[PDB]
């Protein structure tokens, strides 16, 4: 390849000098008060995933790909974060969520509780509860909201409003009798009771809010999408009844009514679009379901009204599931969609009074290499054959997972298969039903007031402490001190 | 595990508040002139490799490992760098070296030339030569030196002083007749002729400096350690003869006299300790060979004399070879040794007038996971069995490489083998003689004057441009402008 302009040293030198000039200009630090705070979380978005997503996004416009800039790549400041649970070397989605939402490290499988709690033991929930940055912002008088592509009562979204010993207790249908007798409430119940004035909630998980055995409104014939609650509670009606009767509250479940709302009138919005987890971006039905960008735009439009700012949390959660299934295409497309949502959010706000942070909870064992030529398709093959079995192979691989395939002592001959298919599983080393997480560090991109405080290598729980200080909320309020 | 103190939220909150206090103090930027510049390069040191090395270093002191802090982890500032060649999507060790030493991106397999050069073509090299930061520092009047554990004429060390179309031309014994006729000089020849006043050179590659068939001084009976030059040149004598006769010059090849020199007296030092590449840290013979830390200390002691500062380049090069062989233990130990050398260097200098940068050239396909418990040995097994074949597996794996082992259609019982051995090869997905590089981004750690200029996501060639500006050398000299 080697584009023509790239063969002149002057081109590279001029680009480097321009970057240096911008860096020198960046020494006038932004020391203003962050009226607004927005967090973007990519579930499982490792550094390798970020690079692969950048390459794919570049190639989608018919460019070589490597020189493309992601939206998050334009964030002025970058840092590294370690993501180990107090209980596990390779973290989970719950302990990390507690670490980066409440500021305290906890055990894996528990949400909103300190390390003194034991998984699946009700007692230890009492006296070991920790609040989240969302609660601090709400107590400060701001507006808060949650947007995600997974279930609302999933680990990441639930780590901001709930305190539970087990992450599997989505509703009372999944709680052992001992836990119920001891007096423990499930995550779905805690969503509508712990904090009763959450302005914006959007995502999936419609089956966990209705009495058991009730047919779904979207899939009437689907027997797996029925309600699960054993106490007969209709949680949507409970959510509606907890808000003032002189305000405006809306419940939506489908794309047509999402785009018909007037954000200048709505005050409280609840949206559940799928019975469980929302579909992949490549499998999405653009007629009935919305994309992440549209939800983010609507949420920001609704939230920006309060004169005291707002806090918003956005999660791209299906990257984790895509990696778990061993389908790199789906995960990369999810990452690209999240980057587009980040760009939209950046377009809708201003950096002189808004602090924005993008990060991930953990990593995976996804790898890509093989000495590929410039511009080679991210889902393509390696230039050479294997010098041991004389068979081809792809540039993307997994340490473990369902991609393992050895038909009678011999590996597969991918030449005879469609390796660019949407649901293709790259080969792995050891066969597992699901591929596991990774224990490497993750990257954090920050832009806005006091964003320079995230400068080097930090523990995960440090992330919410700086943001609070930027917004003059929480335990420390020295920024606004006279 | 879960140490006792970690079960209290107050502990984590206090730690986070202390970190925030330090960050708030870092706002008074260091805008001084960098009298000295030091670069640490880890060949193949990816983010996952850094995390694994941190865990191993922590465990070597009988700690859980995850909470340990590396020396480079204490560097105030962190950034991310992209490492693609103009010719390849997955980079090589030569084009990246040119990018981060001269400030221009080039093709893979070529050293010190722009992208207009074609690999293995002498007559395309004239007029396409690019100088390195070492040359800029030397022209500024500073002292310069190179220290590495690989051959001195390897790609990374050679990118700073040589201009060649092919990286394989270590000496005339590896040059095709057409290249010799056209007027090509090999890398080893260029080492002693391009720049004739390099103060400190240390590393391997003793066979490439002597006439062909001349027996080595260390391994007399070793037939593979004999000289290779076909022109009869003794390059050590040439190096000695190019220096003034009223100065002091020393040549050493073995640990005893490396520690007997007086740095306050020596002016020019050349040290070649192994015929080819230096041994692994685990296989090193401490009696005859030195470690990286000792060489770094001696080099800094010699260099700090010049009243105008100095520039030093240090390379831990055997991490790449360890990963290529598929032996994670050796690579992790090499990374730990490099971190120790970084600590020694930091101890020997001051941050008020010295700018220090640590980074890598590219990454690998090394992965580690498996949901391990806190404190689990980095070289240990995963807690569970494989739910597909009912056999164990390790937490460390490779995308490809020699670790592949499938006899009779069945993978290995690792339990019947020593998986903690020094030369154990973790299983991989596709069998290759050597495992390949990785195309993910790499991390950069900076500390010292103007170190804050490396803040976000940058191209690799941007790295040397900032350093020069910090030291008031090169094309841009605006820092010292009245
Ligand atoms: C792994 O797989 C490769 C390629 O697989 C191929 O890809 C799929 C897309 C689909 O076409 C599959 O059916 C197909 O296998 C294997 O490469 C094949 O190798 C065999 C020998 O083992 C070749 O045998 C052919 O036999 C004929 C000899 O008379 C003749 O047709 C062929 O020569 C001709 O090949 C093509 C045929 O389309 C023709 O266009 C050319 O002009 C040429 O004369 C050839 O000798 C197959 O052709 C190969 N198929 C290819 C290259 O697509 C490979 O063997 C296997 N590897 C291992 C290690 O088992
Ligand atoms: C993969 O490998 C595992 C473990 O490998 C084992 O460890 C290595 C370090 C080395 O010792 C290897 O030789 C050894 O295989 C295999 O686990 C074995 O599984 C078999 C079948 O179940 C057991 O068979 C034995 O047969 C006897 C009848 O009961 C009896 O001696 C054994 O019970 C005894 O088990 C151990 C022996 O030291 C001990 O707890 C008591 O002595 C107890 O009575 C047992 O039933 C082997 O013992 C197992 N070996 C080990 C070390 O656990 C595994 O089968 C294999 N997996 C596959 C899928 O092939
Ligand atoms: C997307 O969501 C909207 C809002 O729920 C859906 O519109 C709804 O459509 C149903 C079925 O036609 C309407 O029910 C009907 O309403 C009246 C009486 O109220 C009457 O026609 C029938 O007896 C029946 O009850 C419902 O009113 C209507 N809701 C609103 C707010 O207009 C829409 O169909 C959904 N679209 C897709 C493509 O899924
Ligand atoms: C490490 O390196 C030093 C320095 O090269 C080695 O010492 C050197 O050993 C040689 C071989 O024995 C000495 O040469 C001998 O010297 C005298 C005459 O000068 C005489 O014994 C022999 O005729 C021979 O020429 C040499 O002098 C000596 N040091 C120096 C500075 O020249 C040492 O052996 C090495 N150690 C190891 C463990 O490899
Ligand atoms: C949590 O409550 C449970 C009730 O299920 C307690 O479990 C019993 O506790 C007593 C006191 O130690 C033990 O003698 C019993 O053996 C326990 N039973 C079981 C099945 O574990 C549990 O101890 C309580 N935890 C605390 C901290 O008081
Ligand atoms: C909504 O999804 C539909 C169905 O997949 C898309 O229609 C496809 O569009 C692609 C891209 O142009 C075509 O290659 C397919 O042939 C179309 N399929 C059908 C059945 O018509 C549609 O483009 C999507 N709309 C948006 C706005 O993204
Ligand atoms: C650089 O030199 C090579 C020969 O070493 C030239 O190669 C050309 O191609 C063939 C290859 O065998 C030679 O026989 C031709 O004489 C060469 N010339 C042409 C015009 O093709 C190559 O062209 C040279 N490049 C330049 C710019 O002079
Ligand atoms: C130099 O290397 C030698 C040889 O490995 C080391 O001596 C051994 O060190 C190991 C590790 O502590 C011990 O288990 C052995 O008992 C030692 N003796 C032998 C004969 O192997 C020696 O410690 C190393 N020296 C330094 C300073 O690292
Ligand atoms: C839910 O219903 C299950 C099946 O019973 C019948 O069929 C389903 C499809 C519904 O129409 C249901 O109302 C019918 O009774 C039962 O096995 C299950 O016990 C029912 N659950 C409850 C809580 O009643
Ligand atoms: C290099 O040497 C080859 C083998 O010679 C052996 O090694 C040398 C160093 C002496 O010890 C000699 O007695 C041994 O027999 C020769 O075959 C070869 O031609 C030589 N090559 C050159 C270029 O001189
Ligand atoms: C123990 O750590 C975790 C954490 C979260 C997690 O996902 C909830 C898993 S999982 O891989 O077992 N669940 C899966 C698996 N395959 C899926 C495929 C398609 C859609 C959704 C999926 C969900 C493991
Ligand atoms: C094409 O990209 C590169 C770049 C550098 C490189 O290393 C020079 C290699 S290599 O893997 O083929 N060389 C190797 C291989 N195994 C080794 C084992 C032990 C000691 C040294 C080794 C050296 C490939
Ligand atoms: Ca839907
Ligand atoms: Ca030696
Ligand atoms: Mg999640
Ligand atoms: Mg190297
Ligand atoms: Zn997760
Ligand atoms: Zn997961
Ligand atoms: Zn390299
Ligand atoms: Zn290499």
């Amino acid at each position: 390849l080697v584009p023509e302009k790239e063969k002149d040293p002057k081109y590279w030198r001029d680009q480097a000098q321009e970057t240096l000039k911008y860096a020198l200009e960046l020494q006038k630090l932004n020391t203003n008060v962050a009226k607004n705070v927005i967090m973007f979380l990519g579930d499982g978005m490792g550094v390798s995933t970020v690079t692969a997503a950048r390459i794919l996004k570049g190639q989608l416009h018919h460019n070589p790909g490597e020189e493309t800039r992601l939206e998050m790549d334009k964030f002025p400041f970058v840092a590294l974060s370690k993501t180990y649970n107090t209980n596990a070397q390779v973290p989970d989605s719950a302990g990390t969520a507690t670490a980066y939402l409440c500021g305290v490290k906890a055990n894996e499988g528990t949400v909103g509780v300190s390390a003194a709690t034991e998984r699946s033991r009700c007692n230890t929930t009492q006296g070991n509860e920790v609040t989240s940055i969302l609660r601090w912002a709400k107590d400060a008088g701001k507006s808060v909201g949650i947007v995600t592509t997974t279930r609302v009562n999933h680990a990441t979204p639930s780590a901001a409003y709930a305190h539970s010993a087990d992450r599997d207790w989505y509703s009372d249908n999944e709680m052992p009798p001992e836990a119920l007798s001891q007096g423990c409430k499930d995550i779905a119940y805690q969503l509508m009771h712990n904090i009763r004035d959450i302005d914006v909630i959007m995502g999936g998980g419609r089956k966990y809010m209705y009495p058991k055995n009730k047919t779904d409104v979207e899939y009437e014939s689907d027997e797996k999408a029925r309600g699960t609650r054993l106490d007969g509670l209709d949680l949507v009606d409970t959510w509606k009844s907890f808000k003032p009767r002189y305000k405006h509250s809306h419940f939506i479940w489908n794309r047509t009514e999402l785009l018909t709302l007037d954000p200048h009138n709505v005050d409280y919005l609840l949206g559940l679009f799928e019975p469980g987890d929302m579909q992949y971006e490549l499998n999405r039905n653009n007629v009935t379901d919305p994309s992440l960008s549209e939800m983010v735009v609507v949420a920001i439009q609704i939230l920006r009204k309060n004169p005291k700012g707002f806090f918003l949390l956005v999660e791209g959660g299906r990257i984790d599931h895509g990696h778990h299934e061993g389908k790199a295409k789906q995960a990369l497309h999810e990452a690209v969609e999240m980057d587009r949502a980040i760009g939209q959010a950046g377009s809708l706000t201003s950096s002189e009074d808004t602090l924005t942070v993008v990060t991930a909870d953990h990593s995976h064992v996804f790898t890509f290499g093989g000495y590929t030529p410039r511009g080679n398709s991210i889902f393509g093959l390696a230039p050479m054959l294997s010098d041991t079995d004389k068979k081809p192979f792809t540039a993307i691989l997994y340490g473990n997972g369902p991609g393992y395939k050895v038909v009678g002592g011999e590996r597969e001959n991918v030449s005879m298969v469609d390796y660019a298919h949407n649901n293709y599983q790259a080969q792995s080393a050891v066969p597992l039903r699901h591929e596991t997480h990774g224990g490497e560090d993750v990257a954090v991109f920050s832009k806005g007031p006091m964003a320079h405080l995230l400068h080097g290598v930090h523990e995960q729980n440090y992330v919410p402490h700086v943001m609070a200080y930027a917004a003059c909320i929480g335990a420390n309020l020295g920024h606004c001190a006279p």
Side-chain angles (χ1 to χ4, degrees), chain A:
Chain A
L1 202 137
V2 195
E4 215 53 35
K5 49 165 176 131
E6 292 199 4
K7 318 177 122 149
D8 195 336
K10 192 222 214 326
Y11 161 84
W12 296 104
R13 296 179 178 149
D14 281 0
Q15 199 181 65
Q17 284 299 305
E18 270 327 278
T19 285
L20 176 95
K21 181 179 118 124
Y22 175 65
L24 273 154
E25 187 57 19
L26 257 173
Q27 294 171 314
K28 288 167 215 123
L29 307 162
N30 184 348
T31 57
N32 281 340
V33 170
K35 249 193 41 162
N36 323 87
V37 188
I38 290 149
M39 188 171 338
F40 286 89
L41 187 101
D43 221 305
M45 220 179 47
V47 166
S48 88
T49 296
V50 172
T51 303
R54 166 167 63 231
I55 285 172
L56 168 74
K57 196 205 181 87
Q59 297 186 334
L60 281 173
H61 290 116
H62 306 110
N63 301 116
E66 296 89 356
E67 75 292 333
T68 293
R69 307 232 285 162
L70 285 161
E71 283 304 305
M72 50 186 84
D73 278 348
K74 293 133 189 217
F75 282 53
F77 298 103
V78 156
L80 277 179
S81 99
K82 327 135 84 180
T83 71
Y84 70 87
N85 295 143
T86 68
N87 202 11
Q89 190 183 64
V90 171
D92 230 4
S93 317
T96 63
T98 297
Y100 70 70
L101 284 180
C102 318
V104 173
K105 295 224 172 182
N107 301 303
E108 47 110 0
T110 68
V111 153
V113 279
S114 80
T117 298
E118 321 192 11
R119 216 204 156 157
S120 311
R121 291 281 110 51
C122 262
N123 316 342
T124 85
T125 295
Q126 282 78 34
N128 307 312
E129 289 116 346
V130 289
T131 50
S132 92
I133 174 144
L134 190 138
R135 166 140 268 178
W136 313 335
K138 174 48 99 200
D139 286 353
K142 287 174 153 43
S143 288
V144 300
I146 309 145
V147 181
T148 168
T149 57
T150 41
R151 277 160 285 189
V152 278
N153 53 1
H154 218 71
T156 299
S158 76
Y161 62 86
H163 317 279
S164 160
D166 212 322
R167 67 177 254 155
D168 290 347
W169 300 343
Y170 306 106
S171 64
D172 39 29
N173 194 28
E174 299 96 25
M175 276 171 101
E178 320 104 41
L180 287 169
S181 74
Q182 258 143 39
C184 290
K185 316 310 298 229
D186 46 64
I187 307 157
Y189 177 100
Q190 294 184 61
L191 170 70
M192 316 279 180
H193 288 87
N194 285 358
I195 315 174
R196 292 150 185 235
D197 46 15
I198 303 180
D199 310 72
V200 171
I201 310 168
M202 279 196 253
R206 218 168 36 220
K207 69 162 75 150
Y208 297 112
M209 309 275 171
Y210 286 109
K212 203 182 200 309
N213 263 41
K214 184 176 180 180
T215 64
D216 196 62
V217 67
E218 191 167 342
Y219 313 92
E220 277 113 305
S221 162
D222 201 4
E223 180 264 2
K224 176 172 332 319
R226 308 218 198 98
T228 68
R229 302 208 62 87
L230 302 167
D231 58 28
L233 258 192
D234 172 33
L235 285 176
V236 174
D237 166 56
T238 295
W239 170 87
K240 198 152 182 2
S241 77
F242 277 167
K243 276 124 202 85
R245 193 73 217 61
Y246 60 93
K247 306 295 238 186
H248 204 178
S249 304
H250 273 270
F251 173 69
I252 67 192
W253 60 270
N254 83 351
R255 181 182 187 268
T256 294
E257 55 193 349
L258 165 59
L259 302 170
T260 314
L261 312 168
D262 191 12
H264 255 304
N265 278 18
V266 171
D267 295 305
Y268 297 99
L269 166 75
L270 171 66
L272 310 176
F273 301 105
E274 279 285 293
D277 287 311
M278 273 180 115
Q279 296 168 285
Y280 286 129
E281 182 54 9
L282 291 177
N283 297 324
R284 177 189 136 225
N285 182 315
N286 42 50
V287 179
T288 62
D289 273 47
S291 79
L292 188 51
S293 318
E294 319 182 354
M295 295 198 287
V296 170
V297 179
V298 176
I300 301 203
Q301 281 172 343
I302 292 193
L303 290 169
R304 75 180 150 207
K305 312 210 299 275
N306 169 26
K308 330 173 70 60
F310 67 85
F311 168 87
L312 173 67
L313 167 68
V314 190
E315 193 218 10
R318 299 280 271 162
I319 310 167
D320 209 73
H321 305 173
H323 273 322
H324 277 310
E325 290 196 86
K327 334 263 199 71
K329 206 148 183 223
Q330 315 273 8
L332 302 182
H333 275 91
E334 305 287 331
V336 179
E337 174 50 46
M338 183 174 133
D339 198 59
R340 298 212 235 263
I342 292 166
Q344 298 263 39
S347 96
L348 270 165
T349 50
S350 154
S351 150
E352 292 302 303
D353 68 353
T354 307
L355 151 65
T356 306
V357 179
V358 178
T359 191
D361 56 340
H362 61 80
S363 189
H364 278 271
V365 285
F366 157 91
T367 84
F368 90 87
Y371 305 124
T372 39
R374 173 106 183 243
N376 198 75
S377 166
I378 193 81
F379 309 118
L381 259 52
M384 68 277 197
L385 295 190
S386 153
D387 62 63
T388 298
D389 55 19
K390 323 281 162 212
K391 291 197 285 291
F393 59 106
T394 66
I396 284 175
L397 295 148
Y398 281 103
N400 51 57
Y404 191 86
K405 182 175 175 61
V406 159
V407 313
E410 309 297 342
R411 46 186 288 263
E412 191 187 18
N413 191 348
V414 298
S415 58
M416 316 179 66
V417 314
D418 183 9
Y419 33 82
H421 193 245
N422 275 9
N423 308 308
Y424 176 70
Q425 285 150 338
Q427 295 177 345
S428 73
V430 44
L432 292 171
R433 189 165 149 290
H434 292 316
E435 76 107 36
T436 76
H437 291 178
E440 322 101 11
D441 294 19
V442 296
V444 196
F445 313 88
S446 197
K447 144 192 74 174
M450 299 289 240
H452 46 279
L453 298 185
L454 282 151
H455 53 78
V457 182
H458 307 295
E459 295 261 2
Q460 218 177 12
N461 77 293
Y462 173 72
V463 178
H465 279 277
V466 39
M467 300 219 270
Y469 185 86
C472 274
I473 67 163
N476 193 338
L477 315 167
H479 201 204
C480 301

